[PDB]
Amino acid sequence: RQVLKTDRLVLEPQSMARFDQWFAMERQRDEAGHRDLTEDQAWLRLCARQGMWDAYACGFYYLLDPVSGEMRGEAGFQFRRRGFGPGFDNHPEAAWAVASAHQGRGLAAEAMQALLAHHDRSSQRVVALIARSNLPSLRLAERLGFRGYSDVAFDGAAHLLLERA
Amino acid sequence: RQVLKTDRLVLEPQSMARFDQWFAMERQRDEAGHRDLTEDQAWLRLCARQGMWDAYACGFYYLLDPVSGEMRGEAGFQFRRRGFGPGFDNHPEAAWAVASAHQGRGLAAEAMQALLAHHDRSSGRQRVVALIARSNLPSLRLAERLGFRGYSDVAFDGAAHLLLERA
């Protein structure tokens, strides 16, 4: 499980060792399912991330500052069973999120460009789930090669299912 | 990971490979947090069980019938941060459940006796804990028989619960 290096980041496969640090970042993310996580919920979420790596040998990465070790966000792949059928459930699904104090600096683009280039060599068609109201993420997703193929409701809101071949 | 065998059970470390079979067992368990898991919640819970094995080299096992191959339950160790304090959170916590149809035959005891002895050999006999509802008499008795003693109480999930420890 190797660490990747970009111009400004180290990307380190997620594991239990950075739990406290990752948990503080979740708490600072002003969004239901993050700001209101209990410690046991967060812990189980991170355990699942580590399980993904053990089972499929890919998953999520911490975005770290190479000098301070500061956690600037997270990005990578997950297998989920959200119920959007067989072309979406159990496929590698890309997701990313930059920490609150660290946004607007092209960190997400830079991390995902490296993850996707890497994923292309290891493997596959990659999918993503993005709210139709989230214009900047959909902008970034299109630049990364993702194309909207289906709209669904998720959390009683319109979302797109996207795919990148 | 090492499959363990008892007189009446095959104990297989839990992995994603048995997700369909394990998910169907969880849904026939008549208890909040089990009967009412979405497939995605069940999937994340089993991913977390594999994560546990990866980080700590111990965790949960499927209990399989040596004759039919059907799953009779699950037992083992888990690592949790429920907020009961450093005496309890992040220690191997023992837990077990047998499908209702096969309860009352000593299955949980047989699985747990065997998992504890294996644990003792591997990590050289560290303290193990358990969380059990005060109103769950059978389960408290089993726990006493496996070496566990209550040392504290907490409210959890609407109800009084004991913290138990062994060794």
Task: Please state the three-class secondary structure of chain B as a single string.
Answer: CCCEECCCCEEEECCHHHHHHHHHHHHHCCCCCCCCCCHHHHHHHHHHHHHHHHHHCCCEEEEECCCCCCEEEEEEEECCCCCCCCCCCCCCEEEEEECHHHCCCCHHHHHHHHHHHHHHHHHCCCCEEEEEECCCHHHHHHHHHCCCEEEEEEEECCEEEEEEEEC
Four-CA torsion A123, A69, A40, B165, nearest 10 degrees: 110
Rg (CA), chain A: 15
List chain A domain ranges.
Answer: 1-165
- From A16, A42, A82, residue closest to B40, measured CB to CB: A82
CA distance A105 to chain B (A): 32
Q: Which residue of A has its CA nearest to B40?
A: A81
CA distances from B83 to A16, A159, B88, B89, B90 (A): 17, 35, 8, 6, 10
Solving technique for this entry? X-ray
B143 token code pair: 């726990």
Rg (CA), chain B: 15
CB contact under 8 A, A47 and B47: yes
Identify which of A52, A131, A46, A124 has the alpha carbon closest to the alpha carbon of residue A91: A124
Q: How far apart are CA A148 and CA A160, in angstroms?
A: 6
Q: Which CATH number fits domain A1-165: 3.40.630.30, 1.20.1090.10, 3.40.50.720, 3.40.50.2000?
A: 3.40.630.30
What amino acid is encoded at A113 in this protein? Q
Token pair 């819970």 in the structure block, residue: B45
Residues of A in contact with B16 (CB under 8 A): 51, 55
Q: How far apart are CA B70 and CA B113, in angstroms?
A: 21
Dihedral pair phi/psi, residue B9, rounded to 5°:
-145, 150
3-class DSSP state of A31 = coil
Cβ atoms A61, A115 nearer than 8 A: yes
Best A23, A47, A93 residue to mutate vs chain B (most B CBs within 10 Å): A47
> E-strand spans in chain A?
4-5, 10-13, 60-64, 71-78, 93-98, 126-131, 147-153, 158-164
Residues of A in contact with B53 (CB under 8 A): 51, 54
Dihedral pair phi/psi, residue A88, rounded to 5°:
-135, -50
Q: How far apart are CA B149 and CA B164, in angstroms?
A: 5
Cβ atoms A129, A81 nearer than 8 A: no
Domain spanning B1-167: which CATH class is it, in words?
A: alpha beta
Q: How far apart are CA A100 and CA A118, in angstroms?
A: 26
